[PDB]
Design an enzyme around this catalytic site. Structure first.
Site, mmCIF file in Angstrom:
data_model
loop_
_atom_site.group_PDB
_atom_site.id
_atom_site.type_symbol
_atom_site.label_atom_id
_atom_site.label_comp_id
_atom_site.label_asym_id
_atom_site.label_seq_id
_atom_site.Cartn_x
_atom_site.Cartn_y
_atom_site.Cartn_z
ATOM 1 N N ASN A 151 0.835 -1.186 0.000
ATOM 2 C CA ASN A 151 0.000 0.000 0.000
ATOM 3 C C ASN A 151 0.874 1.242 0.000
ATOM 4 O O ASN A 151 1.370 1.674 1.053
ATOM 5 C CB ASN A 151 -0.909 0.004 1.240
ATOM 6 C CG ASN A 151 -1.862 1.176 1.249
ATOM 7 O OD1 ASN A 151 -1.989 1.902 0.233
ATOM 8 N ND2 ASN A 151 -2.532 1.397 2.392
ATOM 9 N N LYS A 182 -0.213 4.080 -0.230
ATOM 10 C CA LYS A 182 -1.006 5.173 0.371
ATOM 11 C C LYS A 182 -0.966 6.402 -0.562
ATOM 12 O O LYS A 182 -0.940 6.217 -1.795
ATOM 13 C CB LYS A 182 -0.537 5.481 1.801
ATOM 14 C CG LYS A 182 -0.515 4.216 2.729
ATOM 15 C CD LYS A 182 -0.245 4.577 4.186
ATOM 16 C CE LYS A 182 -0.214 3.314 5.064
ATOM 17 N NZ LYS A 182 -0.251 3.693 6.510
ATOM 18 N N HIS A 212 -9.600 0.781 4.892
ATOM 19 C CA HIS A 212 -8.341 1.115 5.547
ATOM 20 C C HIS A 212 -8.620 2.076 6.721
ATOM 21 O O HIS A 212 -9.471 2.956 6.584
ATOM 22 C CB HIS A 212 -7.385 1.798 4.575
ATOM 23 C CG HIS A 212 -5.977 1.813 5.073
ATOM 24 N ND1 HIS A 212 -5.511 2.763 5.961
ATOM 25 C CD2 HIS A 212 -4.958 0.939 4.878
ATOM 26 C CE1 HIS A 212 -4.249 2.494 6.263
ATOM 27 N NE2 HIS A 212 -3.887 1.395 5.614
ATOM 28 N N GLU A 227 -7.245 4.591 7.735
ATOM 29 C CA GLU A 227 -7.085 6.019 7.421
ATOM 30 C C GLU A 227 -8.381 6.586 6.826
ATOM 31 O O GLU A 227 -8.749 7.730 7.096
ATOM 32 C CB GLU A 227 -5.845 6.258 6.513
ATOM 33 C CG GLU A 227 -4.536 5.998 7.268
ATOM 34 C CD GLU A 227 -3.388 5.616 6.379
ATOM 35 O OE1 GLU A 227 -3.528 5.683 5.133
ATOM 36 O OE2 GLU A 227 -2.330 5.199 6.923
ATOM 37 N N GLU A 248 -5.574 -4.318 11.108
ATOM 38 C CA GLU A 248 -4.724 -3.191 11.483
ATOM 39 C C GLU A 248 -4.782 -2.940 12.977
ATOM 40 O O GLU A 248 -5.859 -2.666 13.490
ATOM 41 C CB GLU A 248 -5.186 -1.924 10.765
ATOM 42 C CG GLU A 248 -5.174 -2.040 9.290
ATOM 43 C CD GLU A 248 -5.632 -0.749 8.664
ATOM 44 O OE1 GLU A 248 -4.796 0.202 8.592
ATOM 45 O OE2 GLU A 248 -6.846 -0.660 8.346
ATOM 46 N N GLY A 260 0.284 5.687 16.099
ATOM 47 C CA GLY A 260 0.258 7.048 16.576
ATOM 48 C C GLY A 260 -0.320 7.107 17.970
ATOM 49 O O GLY A 260 -0.948 8.111 18.332
ATOM 50 N N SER A 306 2.798 -2.282 11.518
ATOM 51 C CA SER A 306 4.104 -1.891 10.980
ATOM 52 C C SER A 306 4.947 -3.083 10.565
ATOM 53 O O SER A 306 5.346 -3.883 11.394
ATOM 54 C CB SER A 306 4.859 -1.066 12.014
ATOM 55 O OG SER A 306 6.190 -0.884 11.568
#
Ligand code: NA
Ligand code: NA
Ligand code: NA
Ligand code: NA
Lengths: 251, 251
Positions: free
Chosen positions: B8, B10, B93, B95, B165, B171, B211
């Site tokens: 990905n 992104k 996703h 995001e 995920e 974060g 990650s």
């Protein structure tokens, strides 16, 4: 102000073959008078549109994100678009404000980032049915424009075009008249004059972004404060050329 | 189950020139073992990726809309993507769920439309920090998968890949261990087994989408219920190949 017509294909056509046919049609159209023509298409068709579209017209994206790149899966950014030589994007279309939930702060951030990075923008605004029925259209629209204003860097109003969408006349059972279009384009022009000055207000193209067809483009074009159109479905049809050519009726 | 690695990109890279360089790098990589590799990129780079990327790998969109075409300014649809010969899309996703506010009903509708139209999907899920801290991860993730399940047409589970995920580790100041990845991939597999049966659960690739780097891919790949990866930033780097090649450590 040079008459301005943007063809917003929206999420159409379904295939690259159809996009290519449509571009071949546009390429052979005889434009009359003086008009600035921009064509906006889905992201995946932008490279072929940029490569194949007549060079006297410009390609536009239909949206961009607020950032140069990064962890934004699904999003397309200003640098990506510019790397193809594309110079325009639409921002704030009613469909994105409504369906995709884009708010005024998101849209202000996009306008700021886009312009600071050399883009030209077609920034959309317009009130919904309840504000139209309440007679509070100018207040609603003014609040939108006031969110937009601080995003425009100094010296960049030449890179700004504003499109008025009568959202109250989209899927509501009400229709907009020619006088409605004129009245709201003038409301916007006066807001600019009051807020950023007459010189800017007199330069900025304000477009009518409601339903524009071969049967109503000439009368619309003739309204004094209507400087062109952000065209919806007719962008996909041979009648787009009639709309482009309506500039000869605007003075 | 064939090991599966999706890269990905992104919203990267910034330019078509950089996309082309990256594709040339990918084209020369020596893959070892047996792995299914899919590469997802921004919409405007999809045509060049489809034209230029090695034919033993497949291109993916990073998102699509719920409809075939229409009044959806800014949106790209399944037919448009397929008209280039592209066979995959990512959906859901973190995001997009978070930044772009995509909810489970929107995402279920996309999965349904995509699969009914011959696409293969990488459907993302995963819990946030508070559910992880409460020890309610499997409940949260189960609710997501349960929204997804009714969207899958009969005979289409072969066209579904699920990516977990660990949003709680993105974060937030917390990191995921190898055992965390294994545990959640297994939680998902068991949810499938309970809800749609062992035969489907035993076929569906479940990926780790936290990650993933050259320094942790081999240990991750070896977890029994981890069937591959949806790779973030390393997708843009030569270490992507190390991650693709980690399949030789998964059994
Ligand atoms: Na300027
Ligand atoms: Na006019
Ligand atoms: Na099948
Ligand atoms: Na494994």
């Amino acid at each position: 102000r040079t008459f301005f017509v943007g063809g917003n294909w929206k999420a159409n056509p379904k295939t690259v073959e159809e996009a290519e046919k449509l571009i071949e049609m546009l390429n052979g159209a005889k434009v009359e008078g003086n008009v600035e023509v921009v064509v906006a298409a889905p992201f995946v068709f932008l490279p072929t549109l940029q490569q194949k579209l007549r060079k006297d017209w410009k390609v536009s994206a239909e949206n961009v994100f607020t950032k140069p790149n990064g962890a934004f899966t699904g999003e397309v950014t200003v640098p990506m678009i510019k790397s193809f030589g594309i110079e325009w994007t639409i921002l704030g279309h009613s469909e994105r404000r409504d369906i995709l939930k884009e708010d005024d702060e998101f849209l202000a951030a996009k306008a700021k980032f886009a312009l600071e990075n050399g883009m030209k923008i077609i920034y959309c605004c317009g009130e919904h049915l309840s504000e139209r029925e309440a007679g509070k259209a100018s207040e609603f629209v003014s609040a939108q424009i006031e969110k937009m204003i601080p995003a425009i860097p100094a010296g960049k109003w030449d890179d700004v075009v504003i499109a008025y969408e009568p959202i109250w006349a989209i899927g509501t059972g009400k229709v907009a008249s020619t006088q409605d279009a004129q009245e709201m384009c003038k409301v916007i022009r006066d807001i600019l004059a009051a807020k950023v000055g007459a010189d800017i207000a007199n330069k900025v193209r304000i477009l009518y972004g409601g339903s524009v067809k071969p049967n109503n483009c000439n009368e619309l074009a003739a309204c004094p404060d209507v400087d062109g159109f952000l065209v919806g479905g007719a962008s996909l049809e041979p009648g787009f050329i009639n709309i482009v050519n309506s500039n000869v009726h605007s003075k």
